[PDB]
Design a protein around this ligand. Structure first.
Ligand SMILES: Nc1nc2c(ncn2[C@@H]2O[C@H](COP(=O)(O)OP(=O)(O)O)[C@@H](O)[C@H]2O)c(=O)[nH]1
Ligand SMILES: [Mg+2]
Length: 353
């Protein structure tokens, strides 16, 4: 059938969500090449009490010292599949759903999302269900038309991370190097939502070498950017929409610590604010127009359930395309081979042996 999306259908007790465990990780380098190590992981290095508070020029180095990752390249699940292949002997996988954390984020935010539609392609292969986002025609059009100032704004986000990160534990941030968005660190995580086992990985911003719990993902820190705010209305508006995204993104991998840099009209970060992941909901708890963690999760569970029961055939060439648009239900279409098939032959053959 189709799956309804509205929040009042998914109120009720917070579902079972197993505390995420890191099964491993991988890194992408300056030219988007996979390495099965943590080389790209950077280390949390906030401004000390000793010296000045933050005064970070997010415009510095734009565009000369900016090497943006090529966005035309469809990567699908490839990097994760490689990790999965290199670790096949860790039958749990057969019952798992496999994705990127980001895809799960969009499921979590669906009941409250007013603008951004999405498309998830789904193939079952050896029991395992694989989900992989397809960029909607609308979203592609917006990406190809990205205005100069929106391109700079993306840079500034990654630039903020450079002021807050050191290459080594207890090191100093070097805000004069290149920002290269091909370079990423990813944690590979195991969880279970309800009775749906999960294998997913997400981009991790940095490690806090001063977190008393030295074990991932507890020791990770997410670094965020947003417009400076003044009126209560701007804060309320931030809590209701943006905070929801931040919560979903870091809750899934079990990242407890989020730091926000608020940027000037002149493009400087003159204040920081820490949002512990577990505290984010307190900002909207009494808000009649707020979001609810268990609405996000109950919908997400219902979607997984829906996808599991819909995708019956075990076939790597077969795709059930799940589509969603704000103010509508999740609908399904069936497709075979190109252009929607996403599991590469090199993976299918090798997992078959
Ligand atoms: N090309 C491309 N890669 C992405 C994008 N978003 C995430 N990735 C990559 O996909 C992997 C998982 O990302 P994920 O955690 O799901 O993204 P996020 O939660 O939206 O920040 C990482 O290796 C990222 O570098 C994107 O919009 N374009
Ligand atoms: Mg971030």
């Amino acid at each position: 059938p189709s799956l309804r999306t509205q929040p009042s259908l998914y109120s009720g007790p917070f579902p079972f969500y197993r505390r995420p465990s890191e099964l491993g990780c991988f890194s992408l380098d300056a030219q988007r090449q996979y390495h099965g190590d943590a080389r790209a992981l950077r280390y949390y290095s906030p401004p000390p009490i000793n010296g000045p508070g933050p005064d970070f020029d997010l415009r510095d180095g734009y565009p000369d010292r900016y090497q943006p990752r090529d966005e035309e390249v469809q990567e699908r699940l490839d990097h994760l599949l490689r990790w999965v292949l290199e670790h096949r002997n860790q039958g749990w996988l057969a019952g798992a759903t496999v994705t990127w954390r980001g895809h799960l984020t969009k499921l979590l935010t669906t009941p409250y999302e007013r603008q951004e539609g999405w498309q998830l392609a789904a193939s079952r292969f050896q029991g395992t269900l694989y989900l992989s986002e397809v960029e909607t025609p609308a979203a592609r059009a917006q990406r190809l038309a990205r205005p100069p100032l929106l391109r700079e704004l993306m840079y500034m986000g990654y630039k903020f991370e450079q002021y807050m990160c050191a290459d080594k534990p207890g090191g100093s941030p070097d805000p004069s190097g290149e920002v290269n968005t091909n370079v990423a660190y990813c944690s590979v995580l195991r969880s279970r939502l309800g009775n749906h086992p999960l294998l997913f990985s997400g981009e991790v911003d940095c490690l806090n070498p001063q977190a008393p719990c030295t074990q991932p993902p507890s020791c990770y820190v997410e670094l965020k950017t947003s417009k400076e705010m003044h009126s209560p209305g701007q804060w309320r508006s931030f809590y209701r929409h943006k905070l929801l995204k931040w919560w979903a993104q870091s809750f899934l991998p079990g990242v407890p610590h989020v730091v926000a840099g608020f940027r000037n009209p002149e493009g400087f970060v003159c204040s920081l604010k820490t949002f512990p992941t577990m505290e984010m909901f307190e900002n909207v708890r009494n808000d009649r127009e707020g979001w609810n963690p268990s609405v996000c999760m109950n919908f997400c569970a219902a979607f997984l359930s829906f996808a599991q029961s819909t995708v019956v055939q075990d076939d790597p060439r077969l795709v059930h395309l799940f589509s969603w648009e704000p103010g509508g239900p999740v609908t399904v279409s069936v497709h075979r081979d190109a252009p929607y098939a996403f599991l590469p032959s090199w993976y299918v053959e090798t997992m078959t042996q």
